[PDB]
Design a protein around this ligand. Structure first.
Ligand SMILES: [Zn+2]
Ligand SMILES: [Zn+2]
Lengths: 275, 101, 67, 151, 150, 117
């Protein structure tokens, strides 16, 4: 339609972790809905079935199962071709809808052993390993760098289990969050008066509020509308930041186009003559 | 309070003070100013009001006007005025005897 | 009982930063600087680690991990 | 466990009939807590709403007429005052002056100080809130609250 | 153009009486150039920054389209009829709820005061030759402020 | 265990339609859409695209209850244009802005940034 503006983007900054950008000339409802997709709708792989062969550790089993689900997983190369479990024709699991992990550790040593993310092995090809320590010429590598201490073991304890990771999205459980956090900010100088400051001098100025380097603090304009939203998406590490954004928009496109097909389905099946 | 004040606010005068009497407020009632019977019946009404005022002073010696009663007649008059679109500056259209009976 | 994978409030993974922290405190008495080097910016992620108590260490010491 | 006791309950002890208690002919139940604070804050006549939010509030209302009211400010841009949207919520056309006794003004001699409307005192007419701010004395378990008159 | 009930250019005596105030509303105290009328009016100071010392032109009408009823109003953005008092800078819609004047003795009906309510924002006007246009019923009044003169 | 299975928050049931349209009994050219298993994310944005259109007289949505996944969208248009077509255009236009946003973001990434992969 003629009244659609088609927005604008600017990437301010990009790292292996963060992606920080500005969206301009669009609606808040778009900005807010797109921020919500970054959390909930972007799909990923995380452990979903844990089968415990032997567990002599001082942590109870369901605790091991909890810590273990929550650990992060690379998915970028494979999260797309993977299908959803319920949709897949197979009974239980298969190579085509899930990937398998195996963990086997025993404390035969006199010193306390730690159980870590590297000790967890993918029966699936090393296309989808755990996040830490793989093709890592990584300056983030410090001391142990176990990514997670699944448990500690004293001389005699042992741990054997199987796990099946599956594709799903954050609306269903928090283990599937593809974000470390999501900053969102709009109209930093409070031109539009969406908040009303009592004694405005008592508030600090963000890094976006510099435009009024002065201390005049918030010049008013009532003919304005919300424009130019600032973002900073931050990667949990399990999916690189730009891929989070591109997959979010596509998923949102997929969800919208589908609602259009059902709305079409109303005009095709049960001919739209009710109203 | 004040017997004189009660008399002033409640009594329907007939001597008609030169204030467009009979044609101010009321409409055709200027035509029933010559009625003897209507004068005696309202004068009878005012006679009941002095006697009621006397009994009511015996019932509530303390002098409180707050009593529990049904309907709330005053709010109803307001509901009545508001709906029929009654303009209080426009002249009346009501016969006093219709009211008393 | 051992530091949780991912901070409650937001999600930033945090168990990985525990072993690193005991090393920094041994080196320096700068809890401010220690938390900073680990990258724990915002304080929700910071309370997580700053307020943890590693009970596991006393717990492991019983001889019978066998029952 | 039968239609017979279900009939008896529906007619005698059903909640909506239990509003005004025969103990002291007043509301047993009124608008309480946050909503009560939120009503005061909403009815202050410095509150203005733009087309987008008014429609959403209209949307949450049940027995809405279906017609959208004309905003109390036409230009430069349409705005509805808070009293105006509260006034769709009042059923039919009940009436009551006062029924505020809010801290406001100058008890005993301020209203006589010519009625510079002072906005404090609440007046509703023909089912529309004309002026004032709603509080526990207007909305609460009061003898003359909006809620009592509505019943 | 709408039929005109009242029309005059007013000058502002004060913008903050007693001082109790609020914010995003201001109470004007005014005086008419015909000096036979007085006025009090609340205005949205946030979007229409008025100031003391300058004469503002105000008009009041009960209609917009030609000279007839229209209070059915879903204000309806789609109307394009140039009947509108649209060249005016500030417009408010409301009803008149109360009117007052000496009404007891001989003649009485001396001058007149009218009370109006624009959605909770109040107005008070005093007059005499404006008696044909005042009510304590009938909604549909529009308050137009324009030009702010020179 | 009186808690519902988490998938039910978003998974469509085989005995329920994705969208339903019912006519208003009060005023003409109004319509009521029921969207099942879809929260504020879809609803808030479709409300805004409808408000963006200049021929929409009224647009709004309400999610009747937190615990029940369902939203309703009511729309009212001028006595000339049908509310269904406005809804069709509202998504299609929204599809167009988001596609252009995805295009513009991707090309923006195509800037000589060296950590794109
Ligand atoms: Zn399968
Ligand atoms: Zn955190």
């Amino acid at each position: 339609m003629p009244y659609a503006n088609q927005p604008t983007v600017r990437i301010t900054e990009l790292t292996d972790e963060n992606v920080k950008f500005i969206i301009e000339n669009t609606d808040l409802a778009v900005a807010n809905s797109i921020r919500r997709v970054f959390i909930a709708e972007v799909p990923i792989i995380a452990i979903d079935w844990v089968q415990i062969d032997a567990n002599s550790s001082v942590l109870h089993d369901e605790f091991i199962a909890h810590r273990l689900g929550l650990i992060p997983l690379i998915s970028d190369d494979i999260v797309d071709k993977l299908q959803y479990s319920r949709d897949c024709t197979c009974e239980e699991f298969c190579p085509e809808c899930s990937v398998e992990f195996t963990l086997d550790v025993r404390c035969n040593e006199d010193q306390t052993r730690h159980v870590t993310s590297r000790d967890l092995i993918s029966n699936s090809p090393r296309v989808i390993p755990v996040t830490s320590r793989n093709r890592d010429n990584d300056p983030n590598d410090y001391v142990e760098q176990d990514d997670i201490l699944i448990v500690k073991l004293r001389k005699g304890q042992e741990l054997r289990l199987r796990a099946y990771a599956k594709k799903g999205f954050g609306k269903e459980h928090a283990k599937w969050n593809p974000t470390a956090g999501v900053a969102f900010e709009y109209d930093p100088d409070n031109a539009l008066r969406h908040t009303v400051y009592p004694k405005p001098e008592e508030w600090p100025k963000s890094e976006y509020s510099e435009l009024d380097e002065d201390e005049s603090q918030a010049p008013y304009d009532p003919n304005g509308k919300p424009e130019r939203f600032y973002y900073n998406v931050e990667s949990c590490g399990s999916l690189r930041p730009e891929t989070i954004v591109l997959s979010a928009l596509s998923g949102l496109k997929k969800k919208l186009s589908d609602l259009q097909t059902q709305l079409s389905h109303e005009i095709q099946s049960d001919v739209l003559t009710i109203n | 309070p004040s017997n004189k004040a009660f008399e002033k606010k409640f009594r329907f005068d007939y001597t008609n003070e030169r204030a467009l009497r009979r044609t101010l407020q009321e409409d055709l009632v200027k035509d029933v100013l010559s009625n003897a019977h209507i004068q005696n019946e309202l004068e009878r009404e005012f006679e009941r009001m002095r006697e009621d005022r006397e009994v009511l002073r015996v019932i509530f010696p303390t002098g409180d006007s707050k009593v529990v009663l049904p309907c709330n007649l005053l709010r109803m008059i307001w509901n009545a005025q508001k709906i029929f679109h009654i303009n209080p500056r426009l002249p009346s259209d009501l016969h006093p005897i219709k009211v008393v009976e | 009982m051992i530091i949780p994978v991912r901070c409650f409030t937001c999600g930033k993974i945090v168990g990985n930063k525990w072993e690193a922290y005991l090393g920094l405190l041994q080196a320096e008495y700068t809890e401010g600087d220690a938390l900073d080097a680990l990258g724990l910016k915002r304080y929700c992620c910071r309370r997580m680690l700053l307020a943890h108590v590693d009970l596991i260490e006393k717990l492991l010491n019983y001889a019978p991990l066998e029952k | 466990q039968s239609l017979e006791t279900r009939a008896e309950i529906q007619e005698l002890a059903m909640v909506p009939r239990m509003i005004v208690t025969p103990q002291s002919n007043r509301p047993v139940m009124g608008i309480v807590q946050d909503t009560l604070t939120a009503v005061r804050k909403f009815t202050k006549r410095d509150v203005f709403l733009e087309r987008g939010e008014v429609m959403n509030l209209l949307m949450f209302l049940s027995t809405w007429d279906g017609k959208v009211p004309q905003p109390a400010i036409l230009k430069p841009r349409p705005l509805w005052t808070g009293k105006q949207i509260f006034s769709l919520i009042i059923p039919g056309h009940i009436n009551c002056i006062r029924t505020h006794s809010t801290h406001p003004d100058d008890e005993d001699s301020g209203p006589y100080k010519h009625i510079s409307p002072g906005d404090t005192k609440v007046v509703v007419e023909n089912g529309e809130l004309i002026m004032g701010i709603l509080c526990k004395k207007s909305l609460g378990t009061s003898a003359g609250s909006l809620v009592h008159i509505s019943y | 153009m709408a039929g005109i009930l009242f029309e005059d250019i007013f000058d502002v005596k004060d913008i903050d009486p007693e001082g109790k105030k609020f914010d995003r509303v201001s109470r004007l105290h005014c005086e008419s150039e015909s000096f036979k009328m007085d006025l009090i009016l609340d205005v949205n100071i946030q979007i229409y920054p008025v100031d003391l010392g300058d004469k503002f032109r105000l008009v009041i009408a009960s209609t917009l389209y030609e000279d007839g009823t229209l209070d059915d109003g879903e204000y309806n953005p789609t109307d394009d009829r140039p009947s509108r008092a649209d060249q005016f800078e500030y417009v408010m819609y409301g009803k008149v709820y109360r009117i007052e004047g000496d009404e007891t003795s001989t003649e009485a009906a001396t001058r007149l005061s009218a009370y109006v309510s624009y959605g909770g924002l109040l107005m008070r006007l005093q007059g005499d030759a404006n008696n044909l246009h005042g009510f304590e019923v009938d909604s549909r009044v529009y308050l137009l402020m324009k030009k702010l003169a020179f | 265990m009186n808690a519902p299975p988490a998938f039910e928050s978003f998974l469509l049931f085989e005995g329920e339609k994705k969208i339903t349209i019912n006519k208003d009994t009060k005023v003409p050219n109004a319509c009521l859409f029921t969207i099942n298993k879809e929260d504020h994310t879809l609803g808030n944005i479709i409300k805004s695209q409808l408000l963006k259109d200049p021929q929409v007289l009224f647009a709004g949505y309400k999610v009747p209850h937190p615990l029940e996944h369902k939203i309703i969208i009511r729309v009212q248009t001028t006595p000339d244009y049908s509310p269904q077509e406005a809804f069709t255009n509202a998504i299609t236009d929204l599809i167009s802005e988001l596609s252009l946003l995805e295009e513009r973001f991707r090309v923006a990434i195509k800037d000589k940034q060296e950590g794109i992969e």
